[PDB]
RNA sequence: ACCAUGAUAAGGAUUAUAAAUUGAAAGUGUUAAUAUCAUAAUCAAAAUUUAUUAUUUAUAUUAAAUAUGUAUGUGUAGAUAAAAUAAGA
């Protein structure tokens, strides 16, 4: 609706109480993630950036 | 290589299913119970909510 | 008031001993390869006394000409510890210098000073954790060789760890 | 020093393999639990005692490996790097897109490492989006973004 | 003589002077109304000598 | 292979410190009827506690509290609260005229080896660390266990209390190293 | 605190299936009902695997995390050992 | 640390050895300025009816002190070793009570000394606008100020680099410029003392006003040129880096002789105890503790009784 | 375990079903193995 | 680890001589009390995960009783859109 202040003309959410994990529906129409900010948070998120940009036997 | 959702992977779901039922006797699926076949060994499984 | 700082009439040699902190150096536990008296850790006594032995001497550094580490590789695949050569008669040296080892008449002239004061073979704490010191003390027949002192008491291989176990090796 | 103790760079690596043993197979318990909780028929080929066979021989397909990873993301999605500190994700003890909890996120501020502009901490900032319907707007501006522009085929 | 009384720390600290012990106990509807916090237990420092 | 003594080993750890290793002499229980066959490697016993098993062991509690009661004299006394992060490190009145400030640990380390016939769960009871960690100033702490990193606090020969606080700073670095102007 | 994320995780008549259960029936048994590949033994079993008609029949070893269980019957058939303690 | 000349670049150790210091970089990170934050304020440590001493510990990453003596009567203060990473308090803290700065005292000139000493002169002598401060220091330490520009490259200053030092100036004791007959404040500064090292009780001394006089006191070991400052009337000894709480200076520095330090510690027994001495670095003891207490003093005489004719002693970890 | 499969019934299809087809590599992101470690498929770390 | 941190409270002053403007609002100084563990030789509290007759505060459950006599808190919270029993001795 264009007079509610959070307009999107895509609806967001449907209008489904219990669409959990659980039904096949749910799990056929989800975004795999691969490739998302969870594969750059596995290879990035290091306590040292400089173990992650080369080897530290091969820099020194 | 596809990406994605899972309906964008046509022969990857193809190449999963022949080698499930390929390495899988049905001498080991044949064990495998639901839950109402489970609470039928109650004395009442089944009354109304 | 001028207090005087505490001295003392006899101090022994050893309290005059350089610290860069004038104080007490750090005391680190050996490495858990010690945990276990086993064939690899028989003979690392053994291995540093035949370095010194063979190394420079001195605040000259004097070189000592016979290389007694040559002799070191024959020693321990016969099995014969340095606590065990402590353990050897004299009847048995001359057997094991001159059949197995082949020691020559000045390399067991060097090697004879180890061997008449029952050095104790017992890695010592220091402030690293590879530790190359090893007590130096003559040992008595009382507490096997192991000179009796700090700790180091009748099977003691390694300071900070436990006995020899003889029954396993 | 150094920059952290070996413990907790452990235990922040099993956590990177976890997210590792993720990407894994998401994919394949995904369709194995699809198939093996669906009652309609899966195909005009497939239907009856051939939908029922398959869908147990999927079951115990799934349930012989060892180590597959069913662990949901949230569950330990709050690992700092930095620091031991823990926080939970949700409340004011954790920001998401530097992924360190507010202990470290303070001393990245008051070290001068990262570039943030600081705004009144009453209100919602500058982007539009935030100021008209709150978090939960913003919430719906990235799909917008993400999926809900292309026209998908 | 006790070493807290003449420490070396209790010069300039107020706080390392006092060879004392604490007992806890669970307040009443008086304490809690002079003192304007509900404490359920409350804390009462005594230096004893037996 | 360690021999009972009673003496504590000092261990010079720097100036000031040092370390006191000595070990509380384990005794052995009662050989009554209720201890005897204890399901110990179970740790979830459902055997019924009859009233004699109750007024046996309150007689060995007795018993154990009288020994416990002549080493008593021979304690330390908590003055300071302990603080408690891994380690708990606590200060104490000495029966010798002296503040010390001493570490307790967790996990077994002898004053030879590290290697015992206790586990972890054994040595937190033992060596006084769920003692130390559950008790306030004010209470008894044994000298049987034993303390690391000990540090005697200094000594001067006036009183601190009733001192004023308003004094010049180098003043009061006079006056606590016992040389005042 | 978010809604129902904690990670640290009761008897109804009428809703005696549908409270701390799976939502069908058509649904299989978890996997610690099952034997996933060869095994030495387990010190403890799991406690969301359902009991099932030979945990009562057979009756070797019921090992909860402790909770060890000697009194067989069929009211504990279809429900898994949540419920159960 | 020194100039990387052809020997020492084709040296491996020179390699590793700077890989086991500070790892992967090899470049060893600099000691940089306290920033705004984390820094406290000036305090007052000591007032008495002659002077006032006040104090700000822990002004540098190197740990040092800056101290501040306040005559009362001539409203005329002096800094001891004057090293602030801000010096903007201390200009703000003598405009407020109506001082008159006239000379810097220095011990020695080390980095830990004179690494802020021309922002100390430009900032509370721009105050003073609205007679100069002076340097007072010892021209044995005129090694160590050629070295200031080394010493800046090693601990990362940069900015104190390209800085003539006030003290290299021509003073009274040099000759003077002729500048040609078609400018003062560079070419010649006035008020400038060279203190020697034949210090006694007799002459020896600065005359603060009001009757104080501030003996300086020769005690090299730690530096070529060591002064310093005894206040008899007062019980205070700014003893700098000869003497701190339970430890004593480096020796492991360039002209620093550990047989020099030993003298040095021995011409300080005749004071009495209740002498609070007020070190460069770290907290302030009195003459009385580090008799019974240090044992850097105890080798010291220990070494003496037994019949060593070079007694040798001296820190290596430590304080520059 | 052989009083243990009593009540808990064995499916056990072996160490094949654990090993995805080289056609699955892209879908599995570079994996065939499903165990619980992961496993590289390059010498250096083998 | 016994450094000289830092927080609390209290009193001072300057400007509006316009009916215009959406909007007549902004900058600068002193005393008391409290308090001050970083140049040194270690170790897993709640680094940290999990479970059992048992210790709480909360979570909801949760009832009788007219024969007489009867049962007043401090606090915890949300956004914030009323106002003169006390002596400028
Ligand atoms: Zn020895
Ligand atoms: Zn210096
Ligand atoms: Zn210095």
Redesign the interface.
């Known amino acids: 609706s264009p007079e509610f202040?959070?307009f999107?003309g895509?609806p967001?959410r449907d209008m489904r109480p219990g669409y959990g994990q659980?039904?096949?529906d749910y799990?056929?129409k989800?975004?795999?993630?691969?490739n998302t900010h969870?594969?750059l948070?596995?290879?990035r998120?290091?306590?040292?950036e400089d173990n992650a940009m080369y080897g530290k036997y091969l820099y020194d | 290589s596809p990406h994605g959702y899972?309906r964008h992977?046509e022969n990857?779901?193809r190449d999963?299913?022949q080698y499930?039922?390929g390495?899988?006797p049905?001498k080991?699926?044949?064990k495998?119970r639901t839950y109402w076949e489970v609470r039928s060994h109650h004395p009442m499984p089944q009354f109304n909510r | 008031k001028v207090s005087k700082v505490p001295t003392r009439s006899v101090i022994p040699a050893d309290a005059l001993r350089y610290h860069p902190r004038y104080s007490v150096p750090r005391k680190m536990v050996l490495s858990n390869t010690f945990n276990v008296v086993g064939e690899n850790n028989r003979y690392t006594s053994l291995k540093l006394i035949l370095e010194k032995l063979s190394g420079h001497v001195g605040r000259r550094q004097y070189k000592m000409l016979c290389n007694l580490e040559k002799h070191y590789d024959k020693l321990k695949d016969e099995g014969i510890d340095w606590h065990e050569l402590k353990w050897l008669s004299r009847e048995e040296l001359i057997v094991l210098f001159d059949k197995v080892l082949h020691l020559t008449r000045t390399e067991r002239a060097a090697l004879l000073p180890a061997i008449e004061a029952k050095v104790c073979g017992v890695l010592r704490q220091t402030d690293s954790r590879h530790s190359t010191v090893v007590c130096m003390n003559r040992g008595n027949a009382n507490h096997g060789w192991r000179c009796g002192r700090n700790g180091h008491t009748n099977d003691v291989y390694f300071e900070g760890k436990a006995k020899a176990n003889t029954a396993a090796l | 020093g150094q920059?952290?103790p070996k413990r907790?760079?452990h235990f922040?690596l099993e956590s990177?393999?976890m997210?590792?043993?993720?990407?894994?197979?998401?994919?394949?318990h995904?369709?194995?639990?699809?198939?093996?909780?669906?009652?309609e028929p899966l195909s005009k080929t497939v239907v009856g005692t051939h939908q029922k066979?398959?869908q147990?021989?999927?079951?115990?397909?799934?349930?012989?490996?060892?180590?597959?990873f069913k662990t949901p993301?949230?569950?330990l999605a709050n690992v700092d790097?930095?620091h031991a500190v823990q926080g939970?994700?949700?409340?004011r003890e954790w920001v998401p897109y530097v992924?360190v909890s507010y202990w470290t996120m303070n001393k990245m501020v008051?070290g001068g490492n990262l570039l943030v502009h600081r705004v009144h901490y009453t209100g919602w900032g500058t982007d539009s989006h935030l100021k008209?319907?709150g978090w939960?707007?913003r919430w719906?501006?990235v799909?917008?973004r993400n999926?809900?522009q292309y026209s998908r085929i | 003589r006790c070493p807290l009384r003449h420490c070396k720390t209790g010069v300039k600290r107020k706080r390392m002077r006092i060879c004392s012990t604490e007992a806890h106990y669970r307040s009443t509807f008086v304490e809690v109304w002079a003192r304007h916090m509900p404490l359920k237990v409350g804390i009462e420092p005594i230096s004893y000598l037996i | 292979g360690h021999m009972p003594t009673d003496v504590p080993r000092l261990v010079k750890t720097g100036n000031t410190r040092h370390n006191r290793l000595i070990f509380p002499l384990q005794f052995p229980p009662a050989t009554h009827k209720f201890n005897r066959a204890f399901v110990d490697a179970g740790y979830q016993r459902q055997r019924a506690i009859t009233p004699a098993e109750m007024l046996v062991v309150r007689q060995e509690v007795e018993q154990l509290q009288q020994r416990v009661m002549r080493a008593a004299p021979k304690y330390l006394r908590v003055v300071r609260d302990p603080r408690c992060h891994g380690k708990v490190q606590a200060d104490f009145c000495t029966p010798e005229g002296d503040l010390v400030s001493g570490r307790v640990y967790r996990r077994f380390y002898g004053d030879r080896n590290r290697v015992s016939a206790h586990s972890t769960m054994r040595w937190q009871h033992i060596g006084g660390w769920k003692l130390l960690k559950r008790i306030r100033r004010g209470s008894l702490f044994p000298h049987n266990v034993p303390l690391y990193a000990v540090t005697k606090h200094a000594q001067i020969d006036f009183p601190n209390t009733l001192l004023d606080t308003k004094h010049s700073t180098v003043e009061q670095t006079a006056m606590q190293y016992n040389d005042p102007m | 605190?978010?809604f129902l994320?904690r990670?640290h995780i009761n008897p109804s008549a009428p809703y005696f299936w549908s409270f701390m259960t799976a939502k069908?029936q058509?649904?299989?048994l978890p996997?610690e009902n099952?034997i996933?590949?060869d095994w030495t033994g387990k010190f403890f079993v799991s406690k969301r695997q359902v009991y099932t008609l030979q945990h009562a029949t057979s009756g070797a070893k019921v090992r909860v995390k402790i909770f060890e269980f000697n009194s067989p019957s069929r009211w504990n058939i279809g429900k898994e050992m949540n419920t159960l303690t | 640390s020194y100039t990387p000349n052809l020997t020492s670049l084709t040296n491996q150790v020179n390699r590793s050895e700077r890989l086991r210091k500070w790892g992967s970089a090899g470049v060893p990170p600099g000691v940089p300025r306290i920033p705004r934050?984390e820094a406290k304020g000036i305090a007052i440590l000591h007032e008495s009816p002659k002077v006032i001493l006040a104090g700000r510990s822990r002004c540098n990453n190197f740990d040092s002190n800056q101290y501040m003596l306040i005559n009362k009567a001539t409203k005329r203060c002096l800094l001891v070793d004057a090293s602030d990473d801000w010096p903007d308090d201390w200009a703000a803290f003598i405009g407020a009570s109506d001082l008159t700065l006239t000379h810097v005292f220095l011990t020695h000139c080390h980095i830990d000394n004179i690494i802020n000493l021309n922002a100390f002169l430009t900032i509370c002598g721009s105050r003073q606008k609205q007679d100069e401060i002076g340097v007072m220091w010892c021209p044995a330490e005129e090694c160590w100020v050629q070295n200031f520009k080394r010493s800046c490259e090693r601990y990362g200053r940069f900015e104190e680099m390209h800085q003539v030092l006030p003290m290299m100036c021509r003073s009274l004791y040099t000759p003077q410029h002729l500048v040609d007959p078609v400018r003062n404040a560079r070419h010649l500064r006035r008020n400038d003392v060279l203190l020697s090292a034949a210090t006694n009780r007799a002459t020896s001394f600065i005359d603060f006003g009001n009757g104080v006089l501030l003996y300086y006191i020769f005690s090299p070991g730690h530096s070529p040129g060591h002064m310093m400052l005894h206040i008899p009337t007062e019980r205070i000894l700014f003893s700098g880096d000869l003497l701190f709480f339970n430890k004593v200076g480096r020796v492991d520095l360039p002209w620093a002789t550990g047989v020099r330090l030993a003298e040095s510690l021995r011409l300080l027994e005749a004071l009495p105890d209740n002498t609070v001495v007020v070190p460069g670095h770290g907290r302030m003891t009195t003459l009385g503790r580090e008799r019974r207490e240090n044992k850097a003093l105890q080798q010291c005489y220990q070494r003496q009784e037994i019949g060593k004719q070079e007694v040798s002693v001296g820190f290596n970890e430590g304080y520059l | 375990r052989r009083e243990l499969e009593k009540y808990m019934p064995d499916?056990?299809?072996g160490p094949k079903?654990?090993v995805?087809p080289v056609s699955?590599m892209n879908?599995?992101?570079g994996?065939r193995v499903?165990?619980?470690?992961?496993h590289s498929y390059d010498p250096h770390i083998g």
């Open positions: 202040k959070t999107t895509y967001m659980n039904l096949p799990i056929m989800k975004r795999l993630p691969n969870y594969e948070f596995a290879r998120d290091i306590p040292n | 899972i992977f990857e779901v999963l299913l499930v039922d390495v899988t049905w080991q699926a044949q495998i | 920059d952290v907790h760079t922040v990177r393999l997210y590792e043993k993720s990407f894994r197979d998401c994919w394949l995904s369709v194995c639990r699809a198939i093996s909780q669906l009652d066979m398959l147990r021989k999927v079951t115990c397909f799934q349930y012989n490996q060892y180590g597959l993301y949230y569950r790097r930095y939970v994700a949700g409340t992924n008051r008209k319907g939960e707007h719906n501006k799909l917008q999926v809900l | 605190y978010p994320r990670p069908s058509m649904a299989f996997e099952y996933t590949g | 934050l | 499916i056990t299809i079903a654990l995805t699955l879908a599995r992101n994996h499903t165990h619980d470690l992961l």
